[PDB]
Design a protein around this ligand. Structure first.
Ligand SMILES: *[C@@H]1O[C@H](CO)[C@@H](O[C@@H]2O[C@H](CO)[C@@H](O[C@@H]3O[C@H](CO[C@H]4O[C@H](CO)[C@@H](O)[C@H](O)[C@@H]4O)[C@@H](O)[C@H](O[C@H]4O[C@H](CO)[C@@H](O)[C@H](O)[C@@H]4O)[C@@H]3O)[C@H](O)[C@H]2NC(C)=O)[C@H](O)[C@H]1NC(C)=O
Ligand SMILES: *[C@@H]1O[C@H](CO)[C@@H](O[C@@H]2O[C@H](CO)[C@@H](O[C@@H]3O[C@H](CO)[C@@H](O)[C@H](O)[C@@H]3O)[C@H](O)[C@H]2NC(C)=O)[C@H](O)[C@H]1NC(C)=O
Ligand SMILES: *[C@@H]1O[C@H](CO)[C@@H](O[C@@H]2O[C@H](CO)[C@@H](O[C@@H]3O[C@H](CO)[C@@H](O)[C@H](O)[C@@H]3O)[C@H](O)[C@H]2NC(C)=O)[C@H](O)[C@H]1NC(C)=O
Ligand SMILES: *[C@@H]1O[C@H](CO[C@@H]2O[C@@H](C)[C@@H](O)[C@@H](O)[C@@H]2O)[C@@H](O[C@@H]2O[C@H](CO)[C@@H](O)[C@H](O)[C@H]2NC(C)=O)[C@H](O)[C@H]1NC(C)=O
Ligand SMILES: *[C@@H]1O[C@H](CO)[C@@H](O[C@@H]2O[C@H](CO)[C@@H](O)[C@H](O)[C@H]2NC(C)=O)[C@H](O)[C@H]1NC(C)=O
Ligand SMILES: *[C@@H]1O[C@H](CO)[C@@H](O[C@@H]2O[C@H](CO)[C@@H](O)[C@H](O)[C@H]2NC(C)=O)[C@H](O)[C@H]1NC(C)=O
Ligand SMILES: *[C@@H]1O[C@H](CO)[C@@H](O[C@@H]2O[C@H](CO)[C@@H](O)[C@H](O)[C@H]2NC(C)=O)[C@H](O)[C@H]1NC(C)=O
Ligand code: NAG
Ligand code: NAG
Ligand code: NAG
Ligand code: NAG
Ligand code: NAG
Ligand code: NAG
Ligand code: NAG
Ligand code: NAG
Ligand code: NAG
Ligand code: NAG
Ligand code: NAG
Ligand code: NAG
Ligand code: NAG
Ligand code: NAG
Ligand code: NAG
Ligand code: NAG
Ligand code: NAG
Ligand code: NAG
Ligand code: NAG
Ligand code: NAG
Lengths: 615, 93, 53, 54
């Protein structure tokens, strides 16, 4: 009858979190003993056993598109890119007018393939003035350059061996620090104390909505955020079924997110080797120009195994039957930015743009076997670019250095971000074509399972117990109220595992060989997250001490619970609320309960007793 | 500055073995019951902190842009927490 | 004298500058000193948490 | 110019106090230095950032 309020802590609670993530990687990334290949900062190496504890008979919502993970991810990536850009020498004096020659003393100029690229060989050899190490001393020296790096100055009649950099007139340019490469590493993003990751192991579960097969995790699976447009490389496959998602299926403008079931090889290759020439321009500033290449300069081409691509497309178009039986159309990108016009990526630092040539040459509308029969080893052209404006950051550009040696490039396929044409009929037929504008789409594609989650150990409940008056990370709770009292020791211990994260930092100044300062938003905000978590725990312990509940988690209350609550049995409260529906019912009155337990429990405390005692 | 520590001689002795800051203008007995009004907000820096929303940026995009202001604010938080920590440690002692 | 690092901190007087004038002048030294303060505090904080447990 | 070696003779307008004649300019259209350049450096004021009070 008597509804004595009772407070509990360390109780499993899961809510929407908005906090800072922490970079990490496997031990192999740090044992490479290189300063940094493109993630290997002094980030905390992964725990020897990040616990992934299952949890059944639960429910949780998901909105993968509204997740704040990719925001901080690309922010920290751009910060690390700027940090690696800092030690690079600048290329501002290179902007002088030059004189180049297209036809050179090499054998091949027209390869076997012709796709409007043989004449556009993008191979010229060019002379250029460069200042010597001394101030007044200069000298003209020659090297090899592509056509995409510059453009013929149209101020005169024609080119006439007169060119200008495309990015110089817009902004500055600096080298890409060739000792740093641009290869991917599995990146695991860990959460602070009081926060965790929630993964949904259901395969049919789409990117949003409710899920039940919960897995609580400390650090995400190692992601490889490969820069890839119109395609995903080395990403997780949708096992058991091809996953198709979108922000708004009714809206054609939204990207069509895809995650495939299998992978296929892509042999994109520049067979002819590359060279390097370190010409000193200034007092310790040297440019590593692309020297004279040895051998016949074969046109950098690419090849794709269309046999397995036919099976992949068969499974996809089997999956593309959203609200139809037989109707689909495939098209190419008619035009736009170069990232969207062609499948863009980087392979070792050189920005490899291997074409989406044979993508639109397919239509699985009536007979799927009609597209499975023509097993076509798709040979195609693949171009290379030396400069790029990352994330529309038109500032100090980055020059891709030589990659010396014959260039092979293999890359899995796991997802094609298609886009529906708005300039077409609605129900007569559906058109899809590749689009690679937003890079964040490819990054959130692998995060539809993982979602950051907050831990709120606070708990209240009415029971018949009362004190004397004066005068298993987060699991094993799908429907329980009594089981939480048993796990008050394990969950409290796991609630404050941040010291284990801080122990393995190894952030004295540097990890592998040598670094600059390189202390930026990542580390300082990690320390800020530590400070704020410690402050949250401090305020919690302060509220415990105010109520006298700092000695134990179980803490009674002097004031009985009011009758404003809707009638309900204690057994029904204990059996079928999992501690969460009850907190949903006392959402607004929780502040009143706090005020009551803070004021009446303290001010109504008498001083002593004198009548009877052992004396 | 605020020094919440206060002392006074009275007859009360423990057993031996063998409204931000107002609501007391001039009081000592009535001020001996309004203590929690100051203690609840003494360690409530998270209230002022929750409204920051400095994830990276606010409007489109910014550079690193973390300078004497933010780091001094963090240091002020740390030292204000250390003061009350030493206080509570002395209380437990 | 266990958690009495505030005695060492009180004499710092790093308001912005000390002697004549300076630039921003806050680098690995000061920030890692603050990190060491925070970690030394956090160690005994978790210890006292285990005590309360 | 945007190119390195290219130079162009372009014209603008300057205040009367921001510069001072040089080279013993008794009576002629002699050159003019900046009042603060020989003392210290100078850079643009980042026009997107306004200097109004809040
Ligand atoms: C650094 O230098 C480069 C190269 O000069 C600039 O990049 C672009 O340069 C072109 C040429 O000056 C700019 O103009 C474009 O012209 C296209 C057609 O070219 C003919 O017509 C122009 C006169 O308009 C002649 O000068 C030229 O010789 C040719 O005879 C147009 O098709 C362009 O506009 C249309 O197409 C684009 C692309 O499809 C669409 O996006 C537009 O909406 C429009 O439909 C354009 O007018 C071009 O503007 C320059 N680019 C940019 C972004 O401005 C760099 O601009 C320069 N750096 C800086 C900072 O200016
Ligand atoms: C990537 O590959 C696609 C597919 O090949 C290219 O798009 C377009 O491909 C068609 C192929 O028929 C080109 O049309 C043909 O052009 C030749 C040469 O002018 C002509 O003789 C044929 O009769 C036919 O018209 C079309 O030109 C081409 N589009 C463009 C803009 O050139 C795409 O160009 C390729 N992209 C890259 C970067 O390689
Ligand atoms: C997806 O993952 C695979 C495997 O991790 C990547 O394969 C990589 O392929 C490149 C060539 O295509 C290999 O390059 C070689 O690296 C060695 C390193 O010493 C170097 O000596 C050689 O001269 C050559 O450059 C690379 O080793 C290989 N494996 C890696 C990086 O682990 C593949 O590149 C990934 N996909 C994408 C899109 O990056
Ligand atoms: C660039 O300046 C030169 C030199 O002129 C002097 O310097 C200027 C900055 C300005 O202060 C003038 O009043 C000075 O007299 C200009 O003169 C010609 O420069 C070219 C290239 O060196 C040379 O071949 C000519 O003989 C010079 N002619 C004269 C009469 O001095 C030059 O014109 C300026 N640039 C442009 C694009 O006009
Ligand atoms: C996308 O495919 C279309 C074919 O449907 C290509 O269209 C041709 O474009 C060239 C331009 O080089 C024209 O000369 C042809 O007349 C066009 N033919 C047709 C039938 O439209 C288009 O070029 C392709 N674009 C890309 C970027 O691949
Ligand atoms: C407990 O709940 C009851 C009913 O919900 C509250 O009764 C209120 O009493 C005042 C008179 O003091 C009336 O003006 C209100 O209209 C009553 N409430 C309702 C909903 O009619 C009672 O105040 C509550 N007590 C506490 C301590 O919360
Ligand atoms: C706590 O108070 C909020 C304040 O409105 C309540 O929110 C409303 O809840 C009703 C149904 O419970 C909804 O129909 C309204 O739309 C909600 N308001 C808004 C603005 O959306 C909430 O329900 C209260 N919760 C409890 C347990 O009493
Ligand atoms: C090109 O190579 C072929 C053999 O592959 C050879 O017969 C021919 O003479 C070569 N031409 C030049 C210009 O080197
Ligand atoms: C080369 O061009 C011709 C006509 O321009 C075309 O028929 C042929 O398909 C092209 N080669 C390749 C490999 O596409
Ligand atoms: C192109 O050449 C012709 C003939 O030499 C000339 O008249 C014309 O001015 C030139 N175009 C330019 C300078 O833009
Ligand atoms: C639910 O997650 C657990 C994690 O241990 C896994 O073993 C199980 O197969 C998952 N079930 C489904 C239906 O995804
Ligand atoms: C995802 O699935 C849910 C049902 O589980 C559905 O309501 C929702 O519309 C789906 N998402 C999209 C984008 O259609
Ligand atoms: C590419 O796909 C194969 C399976 O087809 C897989 O074994 C391999 O690990 C993938 N490559 C990655 C993840 O880099
Ligand atoms: C390919 O996808 C289909 C449906 O999308 C799925 O049934 C099949 O198992 C997948 N293939 C695998 C996992 O090898
Ligand atoms: C999706 O877009 C259609 C129109 O394109 C709109 O009517 C509908 O409300 C949208 N649904 C959602 C969930 O945004
Ligand atoms: C090229 O394709 C075949 C498999 O289809 C094989 O030689 C190899 O796996 C591929 N090599 C790459 C993509 O570098
Ligand atoms: C096909 O791919 C292979 C594997 O890299 C390559 O050697 C060949 O040149 C490609 N092109 C063909 C067979 O036309
Ligand atoms: C879709 O149409 C094909 C005919 O190409 C048919 O074989 C298949 O059974 C149909 N599937 C449906 C209606 O689910
Ligand atoms: C697919 O494209 C081909 C030409 O590439 C065309 O002949 C065919 O009609 C198209 N089929 C559909 C269903 O769009
Ligand atoms: C597939 O081809 C068969 C004949 O081979 C035809 O009868 C059938 O209608 C075609 N499928 C569709 C969906 O039209
Ligand atoms: C393509 O390969 C398949 C093997 O699955 C074979 O049955 C078919 O006849 C081949 N088609 C052609 C045109 O070679
Ligand atoms: C030229 O190519 C060969 C491949 O046969 C390679 O061994 C050599 O290192 C290359 N030359 C360079 C990188 O100077
Ligand atoms: C598409 O919708 C129109 C009316 O909006 C209807 O007349 C037509 O029959 C529909 N298409 C099919 C294949 O039924
Ligand atoms: C899930 O396990 C059993 C069987 O479904 C169920 O009775 C229980 O309430 C659920 N929650 C748990 C085990 O935490
Ligand atoms: C509460 O849950 C148990 C086990 O899941 C079930 O047997 C019982 O019927 C439920 N009672 C309700 C929903 O009132
Ligand atoms: C302040 O002092 C006056 C005079 O002793 C007294 O009347 C008043 O109640 C005091 N408290 C206030 C103003 O809060
Ligand atoms: C710098 O120029 C100004 C203006 O004439 C004047 O102070 C003086 O001439 C120069 N300064 C010195 C220290 O000579």
């Amino acid at each position: 009858e008597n509804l004595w309020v009772t407070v509990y802590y360390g109780v499993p609670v899961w809510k929407d979190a908005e906090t800072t993530l922490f970079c990490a990687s496997d031990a192999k990334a740090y044992d490479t003993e290189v300063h940094n290949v493109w993630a290997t900062h002094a980030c905390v190496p992964t725990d020897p056993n990040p616990q992934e504890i299952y949890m059944e008979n639960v429910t949780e919502e998901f909105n993968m598109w509204k997740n704040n993970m990719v925001e901080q991810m690309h922010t920290d990536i751009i910060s690390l890119w700027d940090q690696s850009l800092k030690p690079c020498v600048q290329l501002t004096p290179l902007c002088v007018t030059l004189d180049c020659s297209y036809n050179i003393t090499n054998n091949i100029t027209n390869s076997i393939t012709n796709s409007s690229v043989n004449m556009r060989e993008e191979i010229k050899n060019c002379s250029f003035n460069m200042t010597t190490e001394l101030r007044d001393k200069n000298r003209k020296v020659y090297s090899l350059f592509y056509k995409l790096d510059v453009v013929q100055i149209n101020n005169g009649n024609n080119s006439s061996n007169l060119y200008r950099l495309i990015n110089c007139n817009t902004s500055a340019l600096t080298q890409a620090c060739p000792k740093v490469t641009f290869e991917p590493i599995p990146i695991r993003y860990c959460a602070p104390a009081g926060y965790a990751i929630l993964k949904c192991n259901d395969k049919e579960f789409n990117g949003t909505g409710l899920c039940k097969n919960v897995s609580t995790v400390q650090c995400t699976h190692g992601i490889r955020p490969v820069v890839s447009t119109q395609l995903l490389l080395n990403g997780s496959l949708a096992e058991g079924k091809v996953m198709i998602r979108s922000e708004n299926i009714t809206n054609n403008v939204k990207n069509i997110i895809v995650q495939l079931n299998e992978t296929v090889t892509i042999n994109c290759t520049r067979p002819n080797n590359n060279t390097r020439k370190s010409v000193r321009i200034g007092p310790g500033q040297t440019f590593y120009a692309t020297g004279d290449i040895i051998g016949d300069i074969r046109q950098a081409h690419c090849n794709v195994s269309g046999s397995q691509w036919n099976r992949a497309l068969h499974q996809v178009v089997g999956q593309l039957r959203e609200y139809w039986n037989t109707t689909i159309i495939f098209k190419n990108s008619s035009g736009g930015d170069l990232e969207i016009t062609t499948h863009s990526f980087n392979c070792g630092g050189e920005f490899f743009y291997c074409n989406t040539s044979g993508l639109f040459n397919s239509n699985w509308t009536h007979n799927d076997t009609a597209s499975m029969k023509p097993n076509d080893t798709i040979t195609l052209p693949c171009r290379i670019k030396q400069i790029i404006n990352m994330w529309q950051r038109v500032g100090q550009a980055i020059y891709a250095p030589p990659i010396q040696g014959v260039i092979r490039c293999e890359s899995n396929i796991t997802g094609l971000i298609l886009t529906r044409d708005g300039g077409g009929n609605i129900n007569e037929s559906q058109i899809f074509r590749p689009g690679g504008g937003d890079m964040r789409d490819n990054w959130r594609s692998e995060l539809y399972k993982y979602k950051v989650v907050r831990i709120e150990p606070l708990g209240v409940a009415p029971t018949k117990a009362k004190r004397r008056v004066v005068e298993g990370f987060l699991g094993t709770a799908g429907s329980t109220m009594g089981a939480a009292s048993i796990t008050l020791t394990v969950q409290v211990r796991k609630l404050l595992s941040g010291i284990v994260q801080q122990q393995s930092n190894l952030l004295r100044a540097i990890e592998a060989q040598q670094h600059l300062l390189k202390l930026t938003v990542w580390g300082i905000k990690q320390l800020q997250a530590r400070v704020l978590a410690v402050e949250r725990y401090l305020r919690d312990q302060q509220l415990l001490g105010i109520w006298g509940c700092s000695g134990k988690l179980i803490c009674t209350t002097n004031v009985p619970w009011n009758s404003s609550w809707s009638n309900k049995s204690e057994r029904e409260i204990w059996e079928n609320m999992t501690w969460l529906q009850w907190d949903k019912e006392i959402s607004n009155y929780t502040h009143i309960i706090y005020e009551l337990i803070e004021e009446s429990q303290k001010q109504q405390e008498k001083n002593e007793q004198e009548l009877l005692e052992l004396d």
